[PDB]
């Protein structure tokens, strides 16, 4: 995981600083360590370790468990720091599904890690004073009305809470309080009759104290898993075929776990009432879709039942394999041409095939197909089987059967994506740092405008801003900004490939 | 205007100077090595101030000379930021005014920090200062160096090390200022 530790070295530096990433990378790289050796193995002062640990235990990035002799060891979560890259995709998917108040609720949770409900309804209502005008303040009711609708849909979950020391072990204080999750009240919100108004930044006791709320990242990944399956059906068959897929997965939100190969089977009698009524479809045409989607050999859905009319299940693990295949075959075409992707689809279907059968079955001749075979074994998309005649395993007396393995090529393709994002961040931070003379010069001409904007700001200060020698230099600052906007956007779009890859790698692991 | 700089060093004393007290032979050897030289981060060393601790005088195998580790303090010309000095002019150039400070010579008064009523010359090297009532545009900065009084605003360390294998830039640079009222020649104020 050298690409993961390199990429986590950048995300901790941009979002938290330099004397925290040395603590943060060292916990990922080596393992769970007590507190005295982290100051030793890195070399910072013991106070700066306590600052760097309290900022990493805040954002749910490192954990702690008590071990033998009462020592506390800190263990980082490498998968969690990589999910700091998907923050702009999280704030937008709570803008489509929820109001702009709910867009700011997730934003204060992702930027502070753990907050109380009383603190977030104040801070969101304060920040929504900028979004409004003309006497209308934001009040604590309609913020909390959006908040409790999130906890009904599990996008905000309660943190693991402190234990009750009056019930469990009264007496000597432990070095670490040994927190524990409670399944019942993760979403059982505390009641708040206290209301108020958001202050407009004029610049001139708590009932849920201890009840901290955090963003539930597993809920979004259940939601993003839906749109990968729903928009796949929308391209293949029909939009009416896609809404039926959209209907079943929305019903399967609260009733199945996030790791289940087959969801709860829903009968076709109750899908009909569950669909929105704008679709002029009968019960019989609804049974026509469910028997032609069952006719798909891709098996997005299945029958799996006979009682209650038409019983049908929609598949979860098999739907990811059809997407991760399409994820893995989309890059074979764009890197090596369309005629090379013909082979990668051929050797995938006929599971073990040789050279002579490929050139026959794919109508690509010798010396042009064999170049497209040999550039994929070196890129680890495709392997040999090497069935021998003798135990000598000599090359002149054996058969080399080509084979495409989905799992080994998907882990390989994910490992390229982590380094691909780290290279984009390194190119942006290179061009940002080398124009630190341009940006500060453009900042000083704007600071004359920014400072003294209204109080005593005469009109004879607008002509000395373009008058400085930055006037032909604006060509490069516009060449700067067209570079930063492309590299930031390409940093986001690679995360679409990661989620289709990482979900397939996660779902195929039994984790026994 | 100086600072003491506390340093450690290992000094070789060759064996023909064993007739002489070791406290005198170390002080002669450290002045032969540190005088008139700009150490990188601390500045220009003038002379040895004192020796503060003198450890054991080992004799290593393969040599008869006595090696001893020396703790000492050295006086260093290193003016702090925003300090007022007095010195003479070396001459004039379109790049600025070259101010001489006795032993030291690289002091640049930049044209962006000159006194504002004259900022550019009439294609001539010697810089002027135009006062309206008397001496318009001819109050000159003479190359013979009458005494001025300037204010240091910037100092810079360039690492004069070899870049590349083997087989003259100024390492200790200093940027003064004159634009404050009261600075300048000793005649003007």
């Amino acid at each position: 995981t050298q690409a993961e530790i390199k990429l986590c070295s950048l995300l901790l530096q941009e979002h938290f600083g330099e004397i925290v990433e040395k603590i943060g990378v060292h916990l990922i790289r080596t393992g769970s360590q007590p507190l005295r050796v982290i100051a030793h193995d890195t070399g910072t002062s013991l106070d700066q370790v306590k600052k760097a640990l309290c900022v990493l235990v805040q954002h749910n990035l490192v954990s702690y468990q008590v071990h033998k002799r009462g020592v506390v060891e800190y263990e980082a979560q490498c998968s969690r720091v990589l999910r700091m890259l998907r923050y702009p995709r999280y704030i937008y998917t709570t803008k489509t599904l929820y109001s702009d108040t709910g867009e700011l609720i997730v934003e204060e949770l992702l930027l502070n890690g753990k907050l109380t409900m009383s603190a977030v309804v104040k801070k969101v209502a304060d920040r929504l004073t900028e979004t409004m005008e003309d006497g209308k303040t934001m009040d604590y009711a309609e913020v909390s009305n959006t908040f409790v609708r999130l906890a009904d849909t599990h996008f905000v979950q309660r943190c693991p809470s402190v234990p009750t020391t009056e019930n469990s072990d009264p007496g000597p204080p432990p070095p670490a309080p040994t927190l524990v999750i409670n399944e019942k009240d993760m979403y059982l919100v505390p009641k708040l009759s206290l209301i108020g108004k958001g202050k407009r930044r004029r610049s001139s006791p708590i009932p849920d104290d201890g009840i901290y709320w955090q963003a539930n990242l597993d809920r979004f990944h259940q939601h993003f898993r839906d749109q990968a399956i729903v928009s796949a059906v929308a391209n293949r068959m029909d939009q009416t075929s896609s809404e039926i897929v959209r209907t079943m997965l929305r019903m399967s939100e609260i009733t199945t776990s996030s790791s289940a190969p087959f969801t709860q089977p829903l009968s076709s009698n109750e899908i009909f009432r569950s669909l929105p009524v704008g679709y002029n479809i009968s019960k019989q045409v609804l049974d026509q879709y469910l028997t032609l989607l069952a006719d798909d050999p891709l098996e997005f859905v299945g029958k799996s039942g006979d009682s209650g009319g038409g019983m049908y299940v929609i598949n979860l693990h098999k739907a990811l394999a059809s997407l991760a295949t399409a994820t893995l075959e989309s890059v074979v075409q764009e890197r090596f041409g369309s005629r090379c992707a013909r082979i990668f689809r051929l050797v995938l279907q006929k599971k073990h095939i040789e050279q002579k059968q490929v050139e026959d079955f794919a109508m690509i001749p010798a010396k042009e197909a064999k170049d497209m075979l040999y550039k994929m074994l070196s890129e680890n998309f495709m392997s040999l089987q090497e069935i021998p005649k003798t135990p000598d395993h000599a090359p002149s007396r054996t058969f080399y059967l080509y084979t495409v393995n989905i799992l080994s090529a998907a882990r390989m393709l994910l490992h390229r994506c982590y380094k691909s994002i780290a290279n984009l961040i390194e190119r942006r931070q290179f061009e940002t740092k080398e124009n630190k003379r341009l940006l500060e010069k453009s900042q000083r001409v704007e600071a004359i405008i920014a400072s003294m904007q209204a109080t005593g700001a005469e009109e004879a200060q607008l002509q000395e801003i373009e008058e400085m020698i930055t006037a032909p230099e604006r060509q490069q600052l516009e060449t700067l900004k067209r570079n930063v906007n492309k590299l930031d956007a390409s940093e986001i779009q690679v995360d679409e490939t990661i989620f289709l890859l990482e979900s397939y790698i996660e779902c195929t692991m039994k984790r026994q | 205007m100086f600072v003491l700089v506390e340093m450690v060093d290992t000094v070789r004393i060759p064996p023909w100077q064993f007739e002489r007290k070791l406290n005198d032979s170390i002080a002669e050897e450290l002045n032969k090595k540190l005088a008139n030289k700009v150490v990188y981060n601390v500045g220009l060393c003038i002379c040895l101030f004192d020796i503060t601790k003198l450890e054991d005088a080992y004799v290593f195998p393969g040599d008869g000379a006595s090696h001893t580790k020396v703790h000492f303090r050295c006086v260093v010309f290193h003016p702090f930021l925003d300090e007022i000095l007095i010195g003479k002019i070396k001459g004039c150039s379109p790049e600025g005014v070259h101010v001489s400070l006795g032993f030291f010579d690289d002091i640049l008064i930049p044209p962006e920090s000159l006194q504002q009523p004259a900022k550019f010359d009439e294609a001539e090297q010697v810089w002027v200062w135009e006062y309206e009532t008397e001496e318009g545009a001819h109050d000159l900065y003479m190359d013979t160096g009458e005494e001025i009084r300037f204010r240091v605003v910037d100092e810079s360390f360039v690492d004069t090390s070899p870049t590349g294998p083997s087989s003259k830039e100024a390492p200790y640079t200093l940027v003064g200022s004159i634009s404050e009222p009261g600075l300048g020649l000793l005649s003007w104020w």
């Binding site: 941009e14 507190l35 700066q48 930027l111 | -």
Partner: protein, 103 residues
């Protein structure tokens, strides 16, 4: 010239058509047959781009961005109070934090 190995076990049964001798090494950046697919645009893809650059400027200003402390300042002066970087300090919930982490 003859080698230690047999060429006939490598190949070259005719005895001719040996590969040519590379005179100059290949370039650092060999040119590509295919190009990057252009980016996806739209009103959803661009708002996430706008939200991303706002998070850099935000999280660099928050007190969780623990800067490194300054040192080796040369002298004291009265302008230190004018150059005092003021910023509010966040304090955690020590009930959730272990006891070994108090300042």
């Amino acid at each position: 010239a003859a080698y230690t190995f047999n060429i006939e076990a490598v190949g070259f049964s005719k005895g001719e058509k040996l590969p040519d001798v590379v005179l100059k090494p290949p370039p650092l950046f060999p040119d590509t047959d295919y190009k990057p697919v252009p980016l996806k645009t739209g009103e959803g893809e661009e708002y996430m781009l706008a939200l991303k650059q706002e998070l850099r400027e935000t999280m660099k200003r928050m007190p969780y961005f623990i800067e490194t402390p300054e040192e080796r300042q040369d002298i004291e002066r009265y302008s230190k109070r004018y150059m005092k970087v003021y910023k509010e300090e966040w304090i955690p919930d020590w009930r959730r934090l272990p006891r070994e982490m108090m300042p």
